[PDB]
Amino acid sequence: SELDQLRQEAEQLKNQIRDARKACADATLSQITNNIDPVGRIQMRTRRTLRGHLAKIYAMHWGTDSRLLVSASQDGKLIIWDSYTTNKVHAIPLRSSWVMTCAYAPSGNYVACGGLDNICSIYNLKTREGNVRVSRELAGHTGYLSCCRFLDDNQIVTSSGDTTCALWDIETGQQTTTFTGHTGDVMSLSLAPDTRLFVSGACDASAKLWDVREGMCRQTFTGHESDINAICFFPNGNAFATGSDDATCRLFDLRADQELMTYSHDNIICGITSVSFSKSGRLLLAGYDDFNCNVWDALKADRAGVLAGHDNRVSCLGVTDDGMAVATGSWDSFLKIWN
Amino acid sequence: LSAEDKAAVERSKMIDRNLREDGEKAAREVKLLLLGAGESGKSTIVKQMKITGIVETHFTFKDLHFKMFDVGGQRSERKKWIHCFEGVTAIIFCVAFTDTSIILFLNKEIYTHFTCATDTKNVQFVFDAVTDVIIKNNLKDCGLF
């Protein structure tokens, strides 16, 4: 009399929200963009190769200056690179070698990392001594830690394998807000360029939108068949793209509240590990299990090129804030920068 | 190239050499992923060659370092650490991945060995299993197999 009624109410709410989405689904993005000119074939070559890691590279991030990047690896080493000159700036040893994520603070005074130790650890890169020391280790996540992203020098959101997200205050070391609406392990994050919202994909094949200050889920996006491994905001913050294990990318948008485009080819069966956007949002770069990344025309959903210089599963890729280059990491322990 | 850039290059080279030393130190070690039910007699063998997150164990037999990663305690999904553990040489299983070998132990290519009274035989068996998987990675590394 109670559980059945609540289930029926949830089902009818889902039906009505799907009907509302269908009502505004009169047009299609492909139909609108059929008239525009094709982007054409794009050849992008490996301009820099960064060597020094002795294990599979799992994460990388760019600095907001677009010159410095930090990469994590299974050898228990954080390496800050100078992409212009290929030479290393720092090498931060880690207590645990099972790190799965790394973040670069937008100011540049801190870096973060985390993994199977259930801790995103903040490292102070600007000390009076010439060493990098661990500023603080944030604990409280039940499961592993798959992504943490810096909001500012004092705030950071973390996604975790305990189906939750959390917003931390670094000085105190405690969570300020928690985000609990997912069902499966949260595998990815992407902060909006205004630092007001973020999207998180999980193993329940759904992506959710959160307001950082509100602390509650705002929109839920479905459509993928398997777990979502990557997520990325459109440059204007009004849309986002998801990559999953069922070998397809999907572009969702927040205002219309539904999927707009599907990026899949019959020649691709391997899953998707990473996804990013060009500075204008016209290109969508997705990395795959089949050892190479390929470029997608974001408005026409056709391939425009391939990044095929890696010898293993491309696990990470990212584009600079000024859009001059994209850096990809793989399990062959090399980082390549493409222009 | 300026003097400051030259000194930065020198710093990068010193970091490179430190990384080389650490990698040479870690090249003589082997990582083994240990699975179990948590209450299936695994602790007996764990303490047999012994003498939140994942537990690490260290034990040496003949100039070769083994790391044991007991993951039976974690209740999380089985497949969600596989992408993290995709590179381990072998997986040890205690009972009462297209090219990752499995080592099997009986408390009471797949390699099987019934537990003996002395842990020496068990350690020798696991050492032999790691030898074979290292032989075959070396062969692939070469080009033959």
Epitope: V89, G108, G130, N131 | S2, A3, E10
Partner: single-chain antibody, 233 residues
Framework: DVQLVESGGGLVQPGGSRKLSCSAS????????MHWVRQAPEKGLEWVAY????????YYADTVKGRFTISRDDPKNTLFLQMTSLRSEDTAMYYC??????????????WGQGTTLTVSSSDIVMTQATSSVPVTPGESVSISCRSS???????????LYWFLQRPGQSPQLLIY???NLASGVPDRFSGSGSGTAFTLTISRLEAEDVGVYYC?????????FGAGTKLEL
């Protein structure tokens, strides 16, 4: 905290030998390249020698090459300057200077207190036209420095450094690479210039802004200083 303490010297007969020691504490001594800088009584700064991190690279001034030997003891965080065949021109106050080099770093941050040595008896030229400028407090003052050649490089950064030596104290960095503000110094210090001519601007003058200001180039070795400019109240 970070501190460099110097020892040795004080009275040396001409033609003799001496050993200056610089004991460091409070920071990772091994990661920093270390400089020796001396200033004669009533004279500006003068870079002496440089030993890099890991002892890989060593430089000497042309006036001390052969007679001086710089070395470090990383286990004990100690810096040495073996000085031999000492001349009457070698009497000065010797400073032990801390510097590290990576992208976005500030070298020449910390200076030791100094030790006095009394001896009984092709490169870039940095020029400061003025020597003594009396300014009342609260008035913006401009300090200029000129270079023999352009300090701008292909990287786009010009290697010009500014130091302030208060009366009775060792110099402290306030501007590195002609634009950046050193850690811990007030925001009223600003640096500008283009290639050859440079200007340091102080907005409001407190009682702690009184001292001698030095302009330094780090484009190539030997490192060169300019004749300091003194501010009076």
């Amino acid at each position: 905290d970070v501190q460099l303490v110097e020892s040795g010297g004080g009275l040396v007969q001409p033609g003799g030998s001496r050993k200056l020691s610089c004991s460091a504490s409070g920071f990772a001594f091994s990661s920093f390249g270390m400089h020796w800088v001396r200033q004669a009584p009533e004279k500006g700064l003068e870079w002496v020698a440089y030993i890099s991190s890991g002892s890989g690279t060593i430089y000497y001034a042309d006036t001390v090459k052969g007679r001086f030997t710089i070395s470090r003891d990383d286990p004990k965080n100690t810096l040495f300057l073996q000085m031999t065949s000492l001349r009457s021109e070698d009497t000065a106050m010797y400073y032990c200077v801390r510097s590290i080099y990576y992208y976005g770093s500030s070298p020449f941050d910390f200076w030791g207190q100094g030790t006095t040595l009394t001896v009984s008896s092709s490169d870039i030229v940095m020029t400061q036209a003025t020597s003594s400028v009396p300014v009342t407090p609260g008035e913006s003052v401009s300090i200029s420095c000129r270079s023999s050649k352009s300090l701008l490089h292909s990287n786009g950064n010009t290697y010009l450094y500014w130091f302030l030596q208060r009366p009775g104290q060792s110099p402290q960095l306030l501007i590195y690479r002609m634009s950046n503000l050193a850690s811990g110094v007030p925001d009223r210090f600003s640096g500008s210039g283009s290639g050859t001519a440079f200007t340091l601007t102080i907005s409001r003058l407190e009682a702690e802004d009184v001292g001698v200001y030095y302009c330094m180039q780090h484009l190539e070795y030997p490192l060169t200083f300019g004749a300091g400019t003194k501010l009076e109240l």
